[PDB]
Design an enzyme around this catalytic site. Structure first.
Site, PDB file in Angstrom:
ATOM      1  CE  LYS A 133      -3.738  -1.303 -14.084  1.00 22.04           C
ATOM      2  NZ  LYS A 133      -4.847  -1.726 -13.529  1.00 22.04           N
ATOM      3  CB  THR A 134       1.170  -6.207 -13.276  1.00 20.02           C
ATOM      4  OG1 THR A 134       0.550  -4.970 -12.228  1.00 20.02           O
ATOM      5  CG2 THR A 134       3.001  -6.061 -12.205  1.00 20.02           C
ATOM      6  CG  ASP A 152      -7.584  -8.666 -10.797  1.00 18.23           C
ATOM      7  OD1 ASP A 152      -6.674  -9.322 -10.803  1.00 18.23           O
ATOM      8  OD2 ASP A 152      -8.326  -7.623 -10.368  1.00 18.23           O
TER       9      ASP A 152
END
Ligand SMILES: Nc1nc2c(ncn2[C@@H]2O[C@H](COP(=O)(O)OP(=O)(O)O)[C@@H](O)[C@H]2O)c(=O)[nH]1
Ligand SMILES: [Mg+2]
Lengths: 369, 12
Positions: free
Chosen positions: A20-21, A17
């Protein structure tokens, strides 16, 4: 031009959370807008993007377990990692574990992206987080004090705000300036894992690194005492080659070597470039029960098979201080002692097996002898 | 060696 362009493997590491994405998407979107375009379960996100000079192949993983597995096995290969740290949490347990894993697996560079700066309007707070990141990096032999730290907001950059998109460009600038071009396989010292051996002594296999040339000296490393020989020829698909290159499956005629002098697990190598070892420190991931791995923990005295390139080698293990057993699904530092020596350098991958079943995967972290 | 399209093999 894009054909001649260097390829660099990168990836986002850091606590769950932390962004990174979101950062991975902000990187692809900002660069697209600015410049244009075995039995282990591998969970990954792969994307590619470009800067004017480089082509990047970027890996992102969903959970912490994926990072452990992917970094150890080499599925998430990185020439450089982008450590994502949220300013709102600061470094967390997986930030530390990802840096440690990066060291052990041989990730050679780490750039930091201090994320969620849209949430934190406090310079003292931000410097405190940077301070903690740099100390954590230096703790694991990365140059903490000299590491680039970009302050940004992956979400606001993903939301189109140019002032924050400017931080994504800064991060891309460091991918370009800070991560050197990786050393090509063809320019590394010659290495050929032996698959088959024939008398006519021809040894076959895939040239892993460098080039083998007729007239040159080669070393037969592993299992038994090291043997030197001269290459008398190279053949491929019945056609004689002048030289054998990395990535090719070839055959090598070795002068004065008899079939009985070659064993399984041995490698062909440029003289003095790889040494045999029985003992090493490694980072190992043990498969969970749900991945077709072991059902119960193992203890010191566990004698599994270590599969190095072409063959299984029996070995005994030393567990870290205060570690009695290893549960399926665990990843730990493991000191291994093999029965026969194997040619190895740090970064060498192996499978841990029980019969014809992979129960674990590992990487050589430190060769000891 | 001995090959001819994609497996390990050789000659010399
Ligand atoms: N405020 C804010 N939220 C962010 C930022 N980057 C990511 N997030 C949010 O943080 C959460 C987790 O982000 P995600 O990228 O999925 O994290 P990951 O688990 O590290 O991949 C989501 O709700 C995102 O929208 C940022 O820069 N600012
Ligand atoms: Mg994610």
């Amino acid at each position: 031009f894009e054909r001649t362009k260097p390829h660099v493997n990168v990836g986002t590491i850091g606590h769950v959370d932390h962004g990174k994405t979101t950062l991975t998407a902000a990187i692809t979107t900002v660069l697209a807008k600015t410049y244009g375009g075995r039995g282990i379960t591998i969970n990954t996100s792969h994307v590619e993007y470009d800067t004017p000079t480089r082509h990047y192949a970027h890996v992102d993983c969903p959970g912490h377990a994926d990072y452990v597995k992917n970094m150890i096995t080499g599925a998430a290969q990185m020439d450089g990692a982008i450590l994502v740290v949220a300013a709102t949490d600061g470094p967390m347990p997986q930030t530390r574990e990802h840096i440690l894993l990066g060291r052990q697996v041989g990730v050679p560079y780490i750039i930091v992206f201090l994320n969620k700066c849209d949430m934190v309007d406090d310079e003292e707070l931000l410097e405190l987080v940077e301070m903690e990141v740099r100390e954590l990096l230096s703790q694991y032999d990365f140059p903490g004090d000299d590491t680039p730290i970009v302050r940004g907001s992956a979400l606001k950059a993903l939301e189109g705000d140019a002032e924050w998109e400017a931080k994504i460009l800064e991060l891309a600038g460091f991918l370009d300036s800070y991560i050197p071009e990786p050393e090509r396989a063809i320019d590394k010292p010659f290495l050929l894992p032996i698959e088959d051996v024939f008398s006519i002594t021809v040894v076959t296999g895939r040239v892993e690194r460098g080039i083998i040339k007729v007239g040159e000296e080669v070393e037969i490393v592993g299992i038994k005492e090291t043997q030197k020989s001269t290459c008398t020829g190279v053949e491929m698909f019945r056609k004689l080659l002048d030289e054998g290159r990395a990535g090719e499956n070839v055959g090598v005629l070795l002068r004065g070597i008899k079939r009985e002098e070659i064993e399984r697990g041995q490698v062909l190598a440029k003289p003095g470039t790889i040494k045999p070892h029985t003992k090493f420190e490694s980072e190992v991931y043990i498969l969970s029960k749900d991945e077709g791995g072991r059902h119960t923990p193992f203890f010191k005295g566990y004698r599994p098979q270590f599969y190095f390139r072409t063959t299984d080698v029996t070995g005994t293990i030393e567990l870290p201080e205060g570690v009695e057993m290893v549960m399926p699904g665990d990843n730990i530092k493991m000191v291994v002692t093999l029965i026969h020596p194997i040619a190895m350098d740090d970064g060498l991958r192996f499978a841990i097996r029980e019969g014809g079943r992979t129960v674990g995967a590992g990487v050589v972290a430190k060769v000891l002898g | 060696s001995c090959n001819c399209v994609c497996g390990f093999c050789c000659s010399x």
